[PDB]
Tab-separated table of N, CA and C in Angstrom:
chain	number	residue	atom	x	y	z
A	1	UNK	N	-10.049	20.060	6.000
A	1	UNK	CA	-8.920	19.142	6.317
A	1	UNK	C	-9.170	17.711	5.878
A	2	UNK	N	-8.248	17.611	4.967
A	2	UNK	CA	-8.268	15.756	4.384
A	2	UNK	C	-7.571	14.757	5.632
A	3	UNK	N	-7.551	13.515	5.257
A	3	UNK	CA	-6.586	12.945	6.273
A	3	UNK	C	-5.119	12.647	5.839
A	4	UNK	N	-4.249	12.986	6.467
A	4	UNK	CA	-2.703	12.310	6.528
A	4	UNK	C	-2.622	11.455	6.468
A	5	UNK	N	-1.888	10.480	5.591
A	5	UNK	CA	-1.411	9.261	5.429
A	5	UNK	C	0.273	9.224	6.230
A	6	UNK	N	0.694	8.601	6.805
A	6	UNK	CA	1.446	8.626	7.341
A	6	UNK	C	2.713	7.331	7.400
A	7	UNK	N	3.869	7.573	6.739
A	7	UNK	CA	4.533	6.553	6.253
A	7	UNK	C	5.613	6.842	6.337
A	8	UNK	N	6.803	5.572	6.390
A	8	UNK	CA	8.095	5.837	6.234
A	8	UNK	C	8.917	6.608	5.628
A	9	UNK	N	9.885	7.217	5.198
A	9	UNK	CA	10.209	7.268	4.135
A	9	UNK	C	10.800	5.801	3.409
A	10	UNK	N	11.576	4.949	4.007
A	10	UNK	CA	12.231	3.715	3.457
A	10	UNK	C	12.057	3.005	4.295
A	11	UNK	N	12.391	1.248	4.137
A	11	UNK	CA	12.029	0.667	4.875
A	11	UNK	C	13.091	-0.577	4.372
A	12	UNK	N	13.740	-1.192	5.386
A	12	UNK	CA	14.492	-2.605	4.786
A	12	UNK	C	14.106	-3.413	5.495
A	13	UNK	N	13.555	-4.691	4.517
A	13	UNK	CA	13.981	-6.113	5.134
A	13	UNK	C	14.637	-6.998	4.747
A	14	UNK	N	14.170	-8.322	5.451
A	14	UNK	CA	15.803	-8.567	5.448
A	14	UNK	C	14.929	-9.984	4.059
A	15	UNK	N	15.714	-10.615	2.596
A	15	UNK	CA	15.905	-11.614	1.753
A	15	UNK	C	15.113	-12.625	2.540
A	16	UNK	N	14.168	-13.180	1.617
A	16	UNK	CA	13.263	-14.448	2.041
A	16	UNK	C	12.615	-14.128	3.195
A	17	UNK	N	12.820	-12.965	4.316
A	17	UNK	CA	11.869	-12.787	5.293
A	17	UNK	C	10.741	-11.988	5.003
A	18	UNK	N	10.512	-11.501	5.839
A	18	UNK	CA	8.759	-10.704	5.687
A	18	UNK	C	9.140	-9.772	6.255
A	19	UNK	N	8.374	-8.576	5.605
A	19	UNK	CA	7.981	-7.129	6.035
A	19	UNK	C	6.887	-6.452	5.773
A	20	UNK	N	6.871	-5.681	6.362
A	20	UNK	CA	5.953	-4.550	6.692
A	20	UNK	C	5.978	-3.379	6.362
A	21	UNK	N	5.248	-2.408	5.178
A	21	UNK	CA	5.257	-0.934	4.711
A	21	UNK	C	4.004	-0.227	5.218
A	22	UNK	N	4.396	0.139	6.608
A	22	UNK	CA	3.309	1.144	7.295
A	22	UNK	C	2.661	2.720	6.218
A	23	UNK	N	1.758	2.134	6.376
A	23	UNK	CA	0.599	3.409	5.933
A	23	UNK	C	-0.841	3.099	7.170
A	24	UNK	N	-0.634	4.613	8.191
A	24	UNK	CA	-1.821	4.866	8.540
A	24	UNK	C	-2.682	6.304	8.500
A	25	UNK	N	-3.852	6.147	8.392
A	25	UNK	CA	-4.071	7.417	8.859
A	25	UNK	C	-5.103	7.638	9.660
A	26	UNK	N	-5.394	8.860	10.488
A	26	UNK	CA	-6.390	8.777	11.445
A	26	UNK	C	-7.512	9.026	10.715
A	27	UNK	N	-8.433	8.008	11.019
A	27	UNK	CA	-9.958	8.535	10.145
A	27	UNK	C	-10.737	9.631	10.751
A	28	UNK	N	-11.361	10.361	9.689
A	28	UNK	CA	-11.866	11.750	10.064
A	28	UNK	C	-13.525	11.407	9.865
A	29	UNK	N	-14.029	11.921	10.495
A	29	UNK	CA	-15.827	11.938	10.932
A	29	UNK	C	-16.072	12.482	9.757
A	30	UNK	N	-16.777	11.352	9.224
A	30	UNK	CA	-17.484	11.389	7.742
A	30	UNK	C	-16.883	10.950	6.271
A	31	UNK	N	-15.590	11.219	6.879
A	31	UNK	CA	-15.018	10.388	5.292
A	31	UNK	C	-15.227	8.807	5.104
A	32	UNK	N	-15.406	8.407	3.705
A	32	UNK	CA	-15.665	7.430	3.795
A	32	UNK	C	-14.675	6.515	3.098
A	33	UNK	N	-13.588	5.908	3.092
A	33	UNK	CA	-12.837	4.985	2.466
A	33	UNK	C	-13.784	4.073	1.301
A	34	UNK	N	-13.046	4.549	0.203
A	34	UNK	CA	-13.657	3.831	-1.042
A	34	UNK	C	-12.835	2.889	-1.862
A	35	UNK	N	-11.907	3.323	-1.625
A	35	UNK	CA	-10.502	2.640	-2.844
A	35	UNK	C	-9.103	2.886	-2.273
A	36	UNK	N	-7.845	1.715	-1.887
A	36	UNK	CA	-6.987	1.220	-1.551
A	36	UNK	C	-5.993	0.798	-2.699
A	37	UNK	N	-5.340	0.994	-2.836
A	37	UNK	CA	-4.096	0.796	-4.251
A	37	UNK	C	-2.760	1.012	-3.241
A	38	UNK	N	-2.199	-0.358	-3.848
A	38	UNK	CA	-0.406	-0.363	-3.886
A	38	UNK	C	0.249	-0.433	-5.072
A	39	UNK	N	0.813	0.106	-5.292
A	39	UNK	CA	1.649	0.106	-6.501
A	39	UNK	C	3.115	0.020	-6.812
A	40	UNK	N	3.772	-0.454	-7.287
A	40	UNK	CA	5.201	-0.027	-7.538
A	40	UNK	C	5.555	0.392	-8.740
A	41	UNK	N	6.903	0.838	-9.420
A	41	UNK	CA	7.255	0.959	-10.431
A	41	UNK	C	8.159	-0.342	-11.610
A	42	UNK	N	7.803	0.152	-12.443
A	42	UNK	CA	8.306	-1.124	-13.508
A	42	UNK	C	8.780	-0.528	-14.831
A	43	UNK	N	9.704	0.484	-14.606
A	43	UNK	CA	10.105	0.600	-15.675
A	43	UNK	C	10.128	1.930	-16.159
A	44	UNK	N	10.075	3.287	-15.538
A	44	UNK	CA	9.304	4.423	-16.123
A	44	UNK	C	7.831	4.477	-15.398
A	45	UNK	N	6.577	3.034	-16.127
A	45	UNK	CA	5.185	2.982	-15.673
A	45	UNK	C	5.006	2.191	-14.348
A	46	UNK	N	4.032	3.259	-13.511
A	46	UNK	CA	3.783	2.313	-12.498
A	46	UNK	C	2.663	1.210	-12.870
A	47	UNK	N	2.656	-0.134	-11.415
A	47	UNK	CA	1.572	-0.606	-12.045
A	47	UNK	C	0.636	-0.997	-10.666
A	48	UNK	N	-0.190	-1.410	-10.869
A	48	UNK	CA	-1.145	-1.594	-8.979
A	48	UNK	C	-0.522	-2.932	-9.344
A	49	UNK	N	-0.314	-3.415	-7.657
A	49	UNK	CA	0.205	-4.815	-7.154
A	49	UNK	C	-1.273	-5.402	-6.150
A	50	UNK	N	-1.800	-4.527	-5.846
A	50	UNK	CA	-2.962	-4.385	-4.967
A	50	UNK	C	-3.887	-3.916	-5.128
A	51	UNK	N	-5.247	-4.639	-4.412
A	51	UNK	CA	-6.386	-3.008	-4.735
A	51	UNK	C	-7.746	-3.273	-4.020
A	52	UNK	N	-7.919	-2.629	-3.159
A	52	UNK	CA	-9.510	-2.906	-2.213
A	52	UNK	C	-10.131	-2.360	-2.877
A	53	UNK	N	-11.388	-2.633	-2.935
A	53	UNK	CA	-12.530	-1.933	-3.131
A	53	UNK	C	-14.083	-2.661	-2.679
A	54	UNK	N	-15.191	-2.432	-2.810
A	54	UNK	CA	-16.175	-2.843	-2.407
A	54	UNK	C	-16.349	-4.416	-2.916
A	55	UNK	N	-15.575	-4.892	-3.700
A	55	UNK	CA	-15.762	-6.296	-3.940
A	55	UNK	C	-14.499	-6.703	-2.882
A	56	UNK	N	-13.547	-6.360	-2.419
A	56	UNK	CA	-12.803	-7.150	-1.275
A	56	UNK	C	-11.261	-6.475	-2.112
A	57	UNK	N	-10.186	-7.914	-1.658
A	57	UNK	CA	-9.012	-7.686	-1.503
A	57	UNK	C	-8.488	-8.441	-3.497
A	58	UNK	N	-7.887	-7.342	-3.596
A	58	UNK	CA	-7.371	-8.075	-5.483
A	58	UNK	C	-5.756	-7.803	-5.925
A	59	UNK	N	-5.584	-9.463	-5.788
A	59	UNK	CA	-3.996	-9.316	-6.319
A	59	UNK	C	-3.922	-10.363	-8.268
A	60	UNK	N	-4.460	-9.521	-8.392
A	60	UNK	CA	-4.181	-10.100	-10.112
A	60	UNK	C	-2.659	-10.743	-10.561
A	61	UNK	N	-1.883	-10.832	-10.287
A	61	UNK	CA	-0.043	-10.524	-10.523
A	61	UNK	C	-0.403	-12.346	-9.563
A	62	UNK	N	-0.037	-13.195	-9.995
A	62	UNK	CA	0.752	-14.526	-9.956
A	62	UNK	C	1.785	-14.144	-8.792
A	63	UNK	N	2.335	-13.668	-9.395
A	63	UNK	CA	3.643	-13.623	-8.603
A	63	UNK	C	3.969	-13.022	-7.132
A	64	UNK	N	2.741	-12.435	-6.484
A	64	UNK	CA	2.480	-11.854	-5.595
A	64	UNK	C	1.051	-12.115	-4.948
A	65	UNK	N	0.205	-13.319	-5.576
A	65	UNK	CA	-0.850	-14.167	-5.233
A	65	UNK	C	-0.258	-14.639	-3.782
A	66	UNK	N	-0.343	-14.704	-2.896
A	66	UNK	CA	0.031	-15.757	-1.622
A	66	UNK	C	0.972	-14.948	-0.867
A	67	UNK	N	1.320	-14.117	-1.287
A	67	UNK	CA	2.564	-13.298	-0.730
A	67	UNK	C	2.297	-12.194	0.191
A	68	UNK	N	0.962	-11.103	-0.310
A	68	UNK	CA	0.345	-10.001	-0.117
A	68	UNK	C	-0.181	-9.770	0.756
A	69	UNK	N	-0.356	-9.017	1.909
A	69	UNK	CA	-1.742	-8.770	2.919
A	69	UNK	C	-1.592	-7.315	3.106
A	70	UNK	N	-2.883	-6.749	3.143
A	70	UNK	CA	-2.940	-5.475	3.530
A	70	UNK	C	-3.947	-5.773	5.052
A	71	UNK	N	-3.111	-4.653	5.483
A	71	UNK	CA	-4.563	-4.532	6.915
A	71	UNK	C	-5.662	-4.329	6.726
A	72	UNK	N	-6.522	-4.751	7.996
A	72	UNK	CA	-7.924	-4.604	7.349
A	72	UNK	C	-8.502	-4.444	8.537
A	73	UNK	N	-8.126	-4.680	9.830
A	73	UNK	CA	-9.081	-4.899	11.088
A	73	UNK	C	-8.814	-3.746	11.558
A	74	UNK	N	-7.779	-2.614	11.574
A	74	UNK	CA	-7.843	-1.277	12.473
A	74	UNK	C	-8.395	0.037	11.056
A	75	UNK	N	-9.616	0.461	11.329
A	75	UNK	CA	-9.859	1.712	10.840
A	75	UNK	C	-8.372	2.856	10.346
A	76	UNK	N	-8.390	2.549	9.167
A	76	UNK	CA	-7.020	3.731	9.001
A	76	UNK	C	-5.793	3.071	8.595
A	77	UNK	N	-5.476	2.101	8.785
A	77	UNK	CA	-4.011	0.844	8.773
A	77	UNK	C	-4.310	0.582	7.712
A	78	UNK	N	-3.581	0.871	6.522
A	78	UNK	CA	-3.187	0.290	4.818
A	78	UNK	C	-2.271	-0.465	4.978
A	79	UNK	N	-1.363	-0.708	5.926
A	79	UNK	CA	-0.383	-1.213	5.919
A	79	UNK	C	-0.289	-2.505	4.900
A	80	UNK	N	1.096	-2.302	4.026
A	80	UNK	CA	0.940	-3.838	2.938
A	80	UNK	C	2.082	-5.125	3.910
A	81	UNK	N	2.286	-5.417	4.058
A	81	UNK	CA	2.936	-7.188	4.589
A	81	UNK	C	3.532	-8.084	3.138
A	82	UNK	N	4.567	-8.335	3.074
A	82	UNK	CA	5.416	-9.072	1.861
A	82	UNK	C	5.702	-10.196	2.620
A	83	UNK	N	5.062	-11.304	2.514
A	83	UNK	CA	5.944	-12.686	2.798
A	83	UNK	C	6.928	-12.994	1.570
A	84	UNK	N	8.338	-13.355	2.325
A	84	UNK	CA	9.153	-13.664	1.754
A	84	UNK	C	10.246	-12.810	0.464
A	85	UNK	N	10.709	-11.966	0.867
A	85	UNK	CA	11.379	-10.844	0.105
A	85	UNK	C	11.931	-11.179	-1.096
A	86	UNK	N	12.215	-11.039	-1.991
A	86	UNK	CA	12.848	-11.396	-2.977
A	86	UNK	C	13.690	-9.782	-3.474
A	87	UNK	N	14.706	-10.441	-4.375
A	87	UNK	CA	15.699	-9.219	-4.426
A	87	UNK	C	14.996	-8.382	-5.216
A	88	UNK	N	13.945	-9.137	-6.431
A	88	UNK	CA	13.441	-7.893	-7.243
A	88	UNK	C	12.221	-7.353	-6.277
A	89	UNK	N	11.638	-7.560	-5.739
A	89	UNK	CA	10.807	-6.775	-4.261
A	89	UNK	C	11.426	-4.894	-4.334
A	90	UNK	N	12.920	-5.045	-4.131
A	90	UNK	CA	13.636	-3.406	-4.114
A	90	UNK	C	12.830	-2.901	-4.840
A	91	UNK	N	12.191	-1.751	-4.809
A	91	UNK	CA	11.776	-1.081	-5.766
A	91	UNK	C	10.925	0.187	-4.936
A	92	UNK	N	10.217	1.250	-5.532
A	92	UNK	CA	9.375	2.232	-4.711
A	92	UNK	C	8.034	2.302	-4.732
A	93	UNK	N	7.119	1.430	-3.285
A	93	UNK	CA	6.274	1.228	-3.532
A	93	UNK	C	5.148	2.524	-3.406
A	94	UNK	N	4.268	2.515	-3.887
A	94	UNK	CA	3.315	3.965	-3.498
A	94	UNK	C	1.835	3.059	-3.066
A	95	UNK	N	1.334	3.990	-1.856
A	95	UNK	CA	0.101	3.543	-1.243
A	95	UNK	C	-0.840	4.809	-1.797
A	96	UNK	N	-2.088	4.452	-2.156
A	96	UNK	CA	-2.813	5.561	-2.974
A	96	UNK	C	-4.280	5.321	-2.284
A	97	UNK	N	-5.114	6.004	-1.121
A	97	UNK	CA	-6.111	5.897	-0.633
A	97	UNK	C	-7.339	7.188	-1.518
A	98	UNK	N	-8.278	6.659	-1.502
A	98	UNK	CA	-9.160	7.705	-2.106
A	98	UNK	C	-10.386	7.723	-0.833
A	99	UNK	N	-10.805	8.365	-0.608
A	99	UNK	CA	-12.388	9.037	0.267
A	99	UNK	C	-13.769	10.016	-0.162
A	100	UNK	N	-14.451	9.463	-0.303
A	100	UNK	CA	-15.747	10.201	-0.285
A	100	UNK	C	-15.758	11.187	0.626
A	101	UNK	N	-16.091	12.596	0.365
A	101	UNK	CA	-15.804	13.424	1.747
A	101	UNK	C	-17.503	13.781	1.800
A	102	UNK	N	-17.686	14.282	3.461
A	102	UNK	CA	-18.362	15.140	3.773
A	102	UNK	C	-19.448	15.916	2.894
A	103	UNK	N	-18.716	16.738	2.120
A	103	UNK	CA	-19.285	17.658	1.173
A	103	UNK	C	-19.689	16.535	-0.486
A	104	UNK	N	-19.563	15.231	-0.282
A	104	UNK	CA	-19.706	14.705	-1.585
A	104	UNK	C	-18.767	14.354	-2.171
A	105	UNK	N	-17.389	14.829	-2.515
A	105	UNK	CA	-16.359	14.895	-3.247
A	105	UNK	C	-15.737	13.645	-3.253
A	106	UNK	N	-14.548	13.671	-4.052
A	106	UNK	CA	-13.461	12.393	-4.018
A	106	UNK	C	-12.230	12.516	-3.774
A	107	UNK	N	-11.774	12.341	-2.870
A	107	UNK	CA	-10.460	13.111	-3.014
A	107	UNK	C	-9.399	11.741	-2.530
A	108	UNK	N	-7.622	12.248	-2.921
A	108	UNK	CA	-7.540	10.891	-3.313
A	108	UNK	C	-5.564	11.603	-2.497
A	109	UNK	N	-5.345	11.344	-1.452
A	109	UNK	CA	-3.772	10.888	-0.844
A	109	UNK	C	-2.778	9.986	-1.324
A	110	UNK	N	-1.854	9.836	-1.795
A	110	UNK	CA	-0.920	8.866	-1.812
A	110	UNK	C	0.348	9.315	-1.441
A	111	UNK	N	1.723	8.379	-0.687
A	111	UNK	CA	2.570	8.574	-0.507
A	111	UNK	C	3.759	7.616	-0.958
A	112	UNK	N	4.603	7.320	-0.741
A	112	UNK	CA	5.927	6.583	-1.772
A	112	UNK	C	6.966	6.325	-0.407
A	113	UNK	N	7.243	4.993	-0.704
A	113	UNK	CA	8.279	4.711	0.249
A	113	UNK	C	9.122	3.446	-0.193
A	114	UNK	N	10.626	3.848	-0.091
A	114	UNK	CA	11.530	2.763	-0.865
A	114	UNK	C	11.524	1.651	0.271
A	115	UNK	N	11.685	0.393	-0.667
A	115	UNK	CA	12.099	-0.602	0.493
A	115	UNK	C	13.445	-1.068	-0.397
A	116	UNK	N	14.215	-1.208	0.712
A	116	UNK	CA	15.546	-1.982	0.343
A	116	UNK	C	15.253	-3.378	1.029
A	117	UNK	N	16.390	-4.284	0.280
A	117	UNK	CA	16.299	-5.509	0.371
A	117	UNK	C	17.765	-6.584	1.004
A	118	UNK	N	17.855	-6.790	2.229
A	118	UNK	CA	19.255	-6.701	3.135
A	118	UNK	C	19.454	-8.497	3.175
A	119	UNK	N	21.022	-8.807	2.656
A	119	UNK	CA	20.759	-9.974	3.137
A	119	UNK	C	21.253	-10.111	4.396
């Protein structure tokens, strides 16, 4: 048994405010969280907007520098946080967790959830 990621299907907030795209999952005895990715789409290609890993928290993209937070203090909570919505924000973001398991392996969850954008 891997772990469940567990997420909306959609989510609206409301223009220039802030929201919240829940991803949790319950951590399982022995897996080890290695790699954190948000992503959205742009066109056909997705692209990462986000990305943990053993060097910390990485938002490369300008445009989402100052804007971004993922959780970090509850074991399991990916959750991403958008200050300040903007209309191009609409789009389908995907949360992509990977784990070291037990047995050695890598194994890798992601799920997809639209956010609409309300004025």
């Amino acid at each position: 048994g891997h772990p469940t990621l567990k997420t909306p299907e959609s989510v609206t907030g409301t223009w220039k405010g802030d929201v919240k795209i829940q991803c949790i999952y319950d951590p399982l005895r022995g897996y080890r969280q290695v790699l954190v990715k948000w992503l959205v789409r742009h066109g056909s290609d997705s692209v990462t907007i986000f990305l943990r890993d053993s060097t910390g928290d990485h938002i490369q993209q300008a445009k989402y520098r100052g804007r971004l937070k993922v959780s970090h203090k509850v074991p399991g909570d990916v959750s991403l946080q958008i200050n300040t919505l903007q209309m191009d924000d609409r789009n389908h973001y995907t949360c992509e967790v990977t784990w070291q398991t037990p047995d050695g392996n890598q194994v890798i969850r992601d799920k997809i959830i639209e956010l609409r954008v309300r004025k």
